[PDB]
């Protein structure tokens, strides 16, 4: 009886891999970024990286390698998915539109063999003869490369070496030759094997086995000039080739592990090296030309260049620009310099990329007291940690607000032929026109000489020769500024009132029904250039210099009335060019042409609230992209403004939208406002670069926010955040963080760098006497952070070796205060289970943090939750309730305990509890008879849980080590005493992410039921709703139809992909739906769209609407 729905709310921002090469064209350099399920494709250029194509996969990318097989134009791409889907891809730009074609594919799973530790490794011989995979212990799978094998039939070869750490193929080999570091009893060794794909053996290897360092872990294969292997370990780097051994041990490397590498120079004379600490190194190999005897390695050298952001990923791009792919922090572009600038760093950051890092914990808060949802996350680790604030929509902050109901139009107005600090604004009302003024922050209201004030205006712009245009409905008029006179006045030959305007700066194109007159503002007067009559009444018009001129508009756009059509015309003549009918019979409200970058655009808003869009040539005209993209229910009125570099289209309606530029596409964000109807840009002497806006009855003036559909603040903590609780009554946050300190001369801990907890505006330490129980330490602190500034107001440091594990903000018993309570644990040298910790009760009262109470406790406090007046806390396998006395004491009755280790814990506003103990989800309710918790229900079946939530009283969402989701439900059947004790898994779904936190909230609000947000390790935010019978069924339908149509990159079945997959089973998806997949219904060519939806009613335009109601869900 379970019907669920999951849409992505924010795509994964962490980077899992990145590879460089020539895959777009041989004449090009690309950077390829791997997400989880996304491949991002860039062209390296002068100004930086230009994005060409972003594609989705039905799999987590786990191997990503470019190669050129003999007689091949450009690089081909190899991708191995985590569920064992392989495939080779080609980039084909044939059409002015792009394609990732699958040259080959096939699934390389094996019924046998355990997943190797250190994971899937994918490698390719320099001769592109073959692909070597290392998927499982004992088994090395081979795929031959030759022009067929379009299914990638493979074979395995037994590998005697049980425990393989890393592998590459060697360069300069007269047969493929593998080179690996394996572990066995006596440490780790490097060994070679030839691959005889002819007979499928391993044969011997080119050179015998040697021992390596106990922590050897990276193998580098260096190309032909030198050819050999480099082995990076801890405290040692070594070159190996035949009987040539070179070894260095520079202490500079002895701290942090080396974690990634890239080669800079094809010769392979310089490699980049990435630490876990962000240190970047250059590895240099020095060459030796031997009076006629090739080149050899004389030595190796390392050199610290500076620091990045912990890197998964390091790609030397060109010209000393490295891309640093990061996962625990923001990714970034970086320039390596020859001279070490200030600080003595050779690394200078050019560019930074937002990663929500691991989202470790989060909470939703209506932060700026608007009935909306904002999200704040603990993100990153180490000297990369931060908070992130995530808000929905574009916003605007307000300067002045003046009331003036039933306005029907506005245009800006500078009062000088020089200075673009416009100082006047003029409102059109029903049949009036009142004029204003600006002394800066003020708005006084008298008119100018020659401005009709009993006529509704349809224009209030600027022209030529110290002159101010006013195309009122009465008559297109002219008023100069210095001459302050009516220098001209046009009227309609028949005394017919005017209808639709159109006015740039140096041109005019009115209309009086189906009629059209083209006038001119050349030296100080009006000039009737033209006149045509249209087939039907004119709804709307538009004219603006689209490039090759600066006032003289070459073409025009026009909305009609009966045939509901838009058209292009040549303006000195009005000669009908190309015209396009749209469906239906509601009128075009607005039409607009705009100059962006490399697609000249024109769009049309209708009046029911629909919009249609078409690019075109300012030179000629070609009917472009068609996808009806609704917005408000009110007729949208388009407009142009000025902003940052690129300037945009602002949709005016009940659903204020802004249309930006995506890939080279166009952005759709909500503007977080009540409703706008008319909106004009600005730059005044009271409100410079800004905007003007009129609602029902208000006028407003402010500055547009960022750009994206989600807007993201960052708060560098320079250390690790672990937990977060909002405190409304204190208007602040509580955050547990930790930092790494290290040995000093004193033996005591020092500090690697300043961080939140060391740089706080006020601080304090733990002075509890509760206990008498070269190296790295953790210091855990509790931070108090201001909800408005986000300054670290105060930071309490816990005791030596106290790790805080849980945090809560609540009231207790009858005490009216709200406290922050923190569950800790005492973490000694080598004692696995810890047997001590504390529950500390803190007070953040007027100004400072107060230590109220303490209670010692015998074990780690893994989780805690305020139940129904008491503090329910899980201490190391035991679950106890606590009482908050009136003396402010926390007490329990040691005889009322529990045999549960709740790594994860939630509560229903009743007497219920979702726990996890021995890999199992648990239901428990409070029995006051026994003062206990009673085990109402369980979910047998293993589940290495990572997170847990209550959906309602009988349904329970859960997430697990294998990237699957599942819902548990209690049985509604007899045997209430057996069948009742087994709750059951009514829904399954392979998410592809690792969930750290669920929480009840939304980022939408000022169709479906409920909403729970979750945060990933990859920084992905998601959302889950409940549905009905009809939808889950309609949608389930939709999906199956949708797979049939939709192309799928490496030929992968969405059905395989989404099916719940562990080690103990693989069942198909139940009770779930990915809105992700549903939403791509709107991203379809109507042809395909009429295939799906071949039958409740049964229409595309019935359905195109259904999906949009869900897009509004986040």
């Amino acid at each position: 009886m379970s019907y669920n729905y999951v849409v992505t709310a924010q795509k994964p921002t962490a980077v899992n891999g990145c590879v460089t090469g020539h895959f777009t064209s041989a004449e090009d350099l690309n950077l390829l970024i791997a997400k989880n399920t996304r491949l991002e494709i860039y062209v390296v250029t002068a100004e930086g990286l230009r994005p060409v194509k972003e594609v989705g996969m039905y799999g987590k990318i786990a191997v990503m390698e470019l190669f050129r097989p003999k007689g091949e134009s450009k690089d081909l791409l190899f991708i191995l998915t985590a569920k064992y889907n392989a495939c080779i891809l080609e980039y084909k730009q044939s059409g002015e539109s792009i394609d990732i074609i699958t040259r080959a594919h096939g699934n390389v799973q094996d019924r046998i063999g355990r997943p190797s530790e250190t994971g899937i490794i994918g490698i390719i011989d320099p001769e592109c003869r073959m692909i070597g995979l290392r998927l499982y212990d004992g088994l090395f799978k081979v795929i031959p490369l030759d022009r067929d094998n379009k299914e990638l039939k493979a074979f395995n070869i037994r590998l005697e070496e049980l425990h393989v750490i890393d592998v590459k193929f060697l360069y300069g080999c007269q047969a493929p030759t593998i080179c690996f570091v394996y572990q066995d009893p006596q440490g780790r060794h490097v060994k070679t094997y030839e691959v005889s794909l002819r007979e499928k053996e391993f044969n011997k290897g080119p050179w015998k086995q040697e021992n390596v360092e106990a922590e050897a872990s990276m193998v580098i294969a260096v190309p032909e000039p030198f050819g050999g292997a480099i082995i990076i370990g801890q405290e040692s780097i070594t070159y190996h080739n035949g009987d040539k051994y070179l070894a260095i041990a520079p202490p500079i490397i002895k701290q942090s592990t080396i974690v990634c590498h890239n080669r800079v120079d094809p010769n392979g004379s310089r490699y980049l090296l990435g630490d876990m600490e962000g240190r970047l190194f250059m590895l240099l190999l020095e060459k030796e030309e031997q009076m006629d005897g090739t080149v050899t390695l004389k030595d190796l050298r390392v050199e610290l260049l500076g620091e990045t952001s912990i890197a998964e990923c390091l790609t030397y791009l060109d010209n000393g620009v490295v891309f640093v792919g990061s996962r625990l922090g923001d990714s970034q572009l970086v320039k390596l310099n020859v001279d070490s600038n200030e600080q003595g760093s050779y690394v200078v950051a050019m560019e930074t990329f937002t990663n929500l890092g691991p989202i470790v914990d989060m909470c939703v808060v209506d932060l700026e007291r608007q009935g909306q949802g904002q999200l704040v996350t603990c993100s990153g680790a180490f000297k990369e940690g931060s908070l992130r604030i995530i808000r929905n929509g574009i916003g605007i902050h307000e300067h002045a607000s003046i009331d003036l109901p039933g306005i029907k139009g506005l245009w800006p107005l500078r009062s000088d032929p020089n200075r673009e600090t416009y100082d006047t604004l003029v409102l059109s009302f029903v049949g009036q026109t009142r004029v204003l003024m600006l002394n800066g922050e003020e708005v006084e209201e008298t008119e100018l000489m020659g401005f009709v004030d009993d006529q509704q205006t349809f224009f209030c712009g600027n022209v030529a020769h110290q002159q101010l245009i006013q195309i009122t409905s009465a008559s297109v008029r002219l008023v100069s500024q210095e001459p302050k006179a009516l220098v001209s006045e046009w009227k309609e030959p028949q005394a017919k009132n005017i209808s639709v305007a159109s006015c740039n700066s140096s041109q005019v194109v009115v209309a009086v029904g189906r009629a059209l007159y083209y006038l001119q503002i050349h030296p100080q007067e009006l000039r009737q250039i033209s006149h045509t009559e249209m087939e039907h009444e004119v709804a709307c018009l538009d004219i603006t210099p689209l490039g090759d001129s600066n006032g003289l508009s070459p073409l025009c756009a026009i909305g009609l009335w009966t045939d509901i059509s838009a058209r292009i015309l040549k303006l000195p003549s009005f000669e009908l060019l190309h015209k396009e009918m749209l469906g239906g019979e509601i009128i075009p409200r607005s039409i607009l042409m705009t100059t962006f970058e490399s697609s000249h655009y024109l769009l049309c808003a209708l009046g029911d609230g629909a919009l249609f869009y078409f690019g075109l040539n300012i030179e000629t005209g070609l009917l472009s992209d068609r996808k009806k993209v609704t917005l408000g229910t009110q007729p949208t009125v388009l407009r142009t403004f000025r902003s940052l570099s690129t300037t945009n289209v602002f949709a005016c309606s009940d659903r204020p939208t802004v249309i930006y530029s995506s890939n080279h596409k166009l952005v759709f964000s909500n503007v977080n406002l009540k409703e706008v109807n008319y909106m004009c840009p600005l730059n005044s002497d009271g409100y410079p670069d800004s905007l003007a806006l009129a609602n029902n009855s208000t006028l407003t003036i402010g500055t547009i926010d960022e750009i994206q559909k989600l807007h993201i603040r960052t708060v560098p903590l320079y250390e690790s955040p672990r937990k977060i609780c909002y405190q409304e009554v204190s208007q602040c946050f509580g955050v547990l963080s930790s930092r790494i300190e290290v040995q000093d001369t004193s033996g005591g801990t020092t500090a690697l760098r300043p961080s939140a907890s060391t740089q706080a505006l006020s601080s304090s330490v733990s002075s509890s006497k509760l206990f008498s129980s070269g190296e790295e330490v953790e210091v855990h602190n509790l931070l108090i952070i201001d909800q408005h500034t986000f300054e670290v107001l105060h930071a309490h440091q816990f005791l030596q070796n106290e790790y805080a594990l849980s945090l809560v903000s609540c009231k207790l018993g009858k005490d009216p205060n709200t406290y922050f309570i923190v569950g800790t644990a005492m973490v000694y040298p080598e004692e696995a289970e810890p047997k001590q910790g504390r529950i500390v009760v803190f007070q953040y009262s007027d100004g400072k943090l107060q230590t109220v109470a303490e209670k010692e406790v015998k074990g780690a406090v893994y989780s805690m939750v305020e139940f129904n007046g008491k503090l329910l806390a899980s201490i190391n396998s035991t679950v106890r309730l606590y009482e908050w006395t009136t003396e402010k004491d926390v007490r329990t009755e040691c005889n009322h305990y529990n045999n549960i280790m709740a790594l994860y814990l939630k509560t229903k506003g009743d007497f219920i509890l979702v726990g996890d103990l021995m890999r199992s989800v648990l239901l428990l309710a409070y029995k006051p008879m026994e003062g206990n918790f009673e085990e109402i229900a369980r979910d047998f079946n293993p589940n290495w849980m990572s997170a847990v939530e209550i959906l309602d009283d009988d349904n329970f969402l859960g997430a697990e080590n294998a990237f699957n989701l599942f819902v548990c439900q209690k049985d509604s059947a007899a045997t209430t005493d057996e069948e009742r004790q087994h709750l059951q898994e009514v829904g399954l779904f392979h998410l592809g992410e690792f969930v750290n936190v669920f929480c009840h909230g939304s980022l939408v609000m000022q169709p479906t039921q409920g909403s729970v947000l979750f945060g990933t390790v990859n920084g992905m935010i998601g959302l889950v709703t409940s549905l009905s019978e009809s939808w889950y069924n309609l949608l389930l339908d939709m999906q199956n139809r949708l797979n049939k149509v939709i192309k799928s990159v490496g030929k992968i079945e969405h059905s395989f992909w989404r099916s719940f997959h562990t080690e103990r089973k693989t069942e198909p998806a139940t009770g779930f739906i990915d809105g992700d997949l549903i939403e791509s219904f709107l991203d379809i060519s109507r042809p395909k769209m009429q295939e799906v939806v071949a039958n409740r009613e049964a229409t595309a335009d019935d359905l195109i609407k259904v999906v949009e109601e869900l897009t509004r869900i986040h």
């Binding site: 996962r327 625990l328 691991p358 470790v360 680790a381 672990r722 790790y803 594990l805 644990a825 973490v827 004692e831 696995a832 289970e833 810890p834 780690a860 893994y862 790594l903 990572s946 690792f994 750290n996 390790v1017």
Partner: peptide, 14 residues
């Protein structure tokens, strides 16, 4: 020890 292991898992099994 369970905590550090846990905090690891949360960051990416590191």
């Amino acid at each position: 020890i369970l905590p550090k292991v846990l905090h690891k898992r949360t960051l990416g099994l590191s």
